[PDB]
Amino acid sequence: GLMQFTLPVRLCKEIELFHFDIGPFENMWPGIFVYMVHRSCGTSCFELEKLCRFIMSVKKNYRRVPYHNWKHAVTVAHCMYAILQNNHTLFTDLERKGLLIACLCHDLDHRGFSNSYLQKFDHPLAALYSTSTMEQHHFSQTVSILQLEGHNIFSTLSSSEYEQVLEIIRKAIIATDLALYFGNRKQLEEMYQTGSLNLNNQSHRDRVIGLMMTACDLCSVTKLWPVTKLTANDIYAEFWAEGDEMKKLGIQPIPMMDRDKKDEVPQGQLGFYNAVAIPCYTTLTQILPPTEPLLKACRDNLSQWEKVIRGEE
Ligand SMILES: Cc1nc(OCc2nc(-c3ccccc3)cn2C)c2ncn(C)c2n1
Ligand SMILES: [Mg+2]
Numbered sequence: 001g002l003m004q005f006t007l008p009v010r011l012c013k014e015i016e017l018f019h020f021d022i023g024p025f026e027n028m029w030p031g032i033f034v035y036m037v038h039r040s041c042g043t044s045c046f047e048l049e050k051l052c053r054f055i056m057s058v059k060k061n062y063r064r065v066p067y068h069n070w071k072h073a074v075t076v077a078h079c080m081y082a083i084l085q086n087n088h089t090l091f092t093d094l095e096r097k098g099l100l101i102a103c104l105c106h107d108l109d110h111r112g113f114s115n116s117y118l119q120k121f122d123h124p125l126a127a128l129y130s131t132s133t134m135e136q137h138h139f140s141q142t143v144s145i146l147q148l149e150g151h152n153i154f155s156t157l158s159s160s161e162y163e164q165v166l167e168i169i170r171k172a173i174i175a176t177d178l179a180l181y182f183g184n185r186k187q188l189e190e191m192y193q194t195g196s197l198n199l200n201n202q203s204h205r206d207r208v209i210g211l212m213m214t215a216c217d218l219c220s221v222t223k224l225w226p227v228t229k230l231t232a233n234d235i236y237a238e239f240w241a242e243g244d245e246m247k248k249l250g251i252q253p254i255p256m257m258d259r260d261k262k263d264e265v266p267q268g269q270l271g272f273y274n275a276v277a278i279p280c281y282t283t284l285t286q287i288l289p290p291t292e293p294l295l296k297a298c299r300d301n302l303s304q305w306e307k308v309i310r311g312e313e
């Protein structure tokens with residue numbers, strides 16, 4: 001009970017900032033997550049022993065893929081920590097509990113391939129889950145790990161609080177299917193502008209948590225430029241492997257995934273910032289004003305990709 005995680009001074013300070021990078025020391029990432037749960041949620045949200053066992057089972061179930069790996073899990077949870085800490089009073093006790101766990105679990109057992117690739121391959125997961133294929137898998141893997149002996153971090157919740165938190169997690173993880181983000185953000189855009197947005201309406205809160213999940217998931221575009229740029233290499237290492245596997249099925253991949261079209265990456269990043277990232281953080285900032293630093297960092301990174309295209313880097 002009296003056992004805090006403490007971080008070295010630089011991390012204790014920088015972890016509070018949206019643009020924090022969790023570092024290359026994998027052994028510190030569990031501690032960083034527990035620290036974040038303790039500050040976000042409280043020192044008795046979870047039994048430390050069960051939480052430590054849950055974290056290590058989650059870690060084991062992330063694969064050694066270039067991008068959709070344990071580092072991404074913890075990175076996405078940190079962005080959620082920063083959103084929750086800057087919006088203290090807007091979220092319930094259950095939501096704070098559920099959303100850091102959701103973020104840690106959101107890409108469990110990811111193979112480095114898109115929903116499209118699984119469907120074109122005719123992977124068994126594409127028969128079991130016809131839409132949001134990997135995301136329904138990720139939720140399935142989260143429930144599996146929660147049911148291991150000694151891994152039920154929610155055991156101290158009442159029956160209906162348990163049902164509510166697993167429902168928060170399920171929706172939060174499904175919302176990371178980027179195919180669903182575009183319509184979710186359009187509806188939030190409409191609701192905010194006509195003034196119908198009501199955070200006491202559960203269907204509206206679901207939508208806002210969905211958008212928070214997209215914001216945390218895309219948060220590589222909200223880091224300092226050297227982090228954004230080096231993370232983009234890991235992102236494209238997966239896309240280009242998927243592209244190779246598309247070519248093995250006799251399907252020309254989209255250019256994003258074709259390593260033969262590396263030269264078009266900077267123009268492809270502009271499209272991504274303009275069509276996905278900037279609109280994501282703009283609507284998030286309209287709904288949750290203290291998340292503005294994410295939008296500001298995203299715009300700075302857009303300007304850096306604009307400089308790459310102008311051959312100034
Ligand atoms: C940082 C980042 N970038 C992404 O896509 C960039 C992207 N490159 C292209 C492209 C590249 C080369 C040639 C032609 C087109 C298109 N587009 C959308 C992401 N997609 C999902 N996530 C999480 C992403 N995060
Ligand atoms: Mg995912």
Ligand SMILES: [Zn+2]
Binds near residue numbers: 176
């Ligand atoms: Zn993700």
